[PDB]
Amino acid sequence: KTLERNVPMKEILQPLWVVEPPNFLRQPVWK
């Protein structure tokens, strides 16, 4: 069977989350 659907790139390449920084402690700021 042939491919006809228009495949977007978001289904393939997922971007990393960089807008809000990482929390290596995995704990909230008040804690």
């Binding site: 971007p15 990393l16 989350w17 960089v18 807008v19």
Partner: protein, 110 residues
């Protein structure tokens, strides 16, 4: 930094009233959380494109200071377009209300 031309084009579409009706129709069956998440995802996609593509690719504006010069130019453009315009208006306001330099006048002597 990248896609400044696309950003100008986005602003032009936003200021177009036909696009306001288009957005009105697109807002049917839609939530504020969804809109906010979409915008945040768009911004993240931009910054992630930068973080990834800077490792191997160089734009036409590449220079020994890198993207620092582009970001400085963005800041300077914003400053001269918005803040200096506001300063002009404030200057004319103060000059009509008190005279030139009226906001820095000394208190009335007692």
């Amino acid at each position: 930094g990248f896609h400044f031309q696309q950003y100008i084009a986005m602003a032009g579409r936003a200021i177009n009233p036909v696009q306001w009706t288009r957005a009105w129709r697109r807002m049917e069956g839609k939530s504020a959380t969804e809109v906010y998440r979409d915008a945040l995802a768009w911004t993240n996609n931009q910054f992630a494109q930068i973080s990834r593509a800077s490792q191997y690719r160089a734009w036409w504006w590449q220079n020994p200071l890198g993207m620092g010069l582009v970001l400085y130019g963005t800041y300077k453009a914003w400053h001269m377009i918005y803040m200096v315009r506001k300063q002009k208006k404030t200057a004319q306001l103060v000059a009509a209300a008190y005279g030139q330099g009226g906001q820095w006048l000394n208190p009335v002597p007692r």
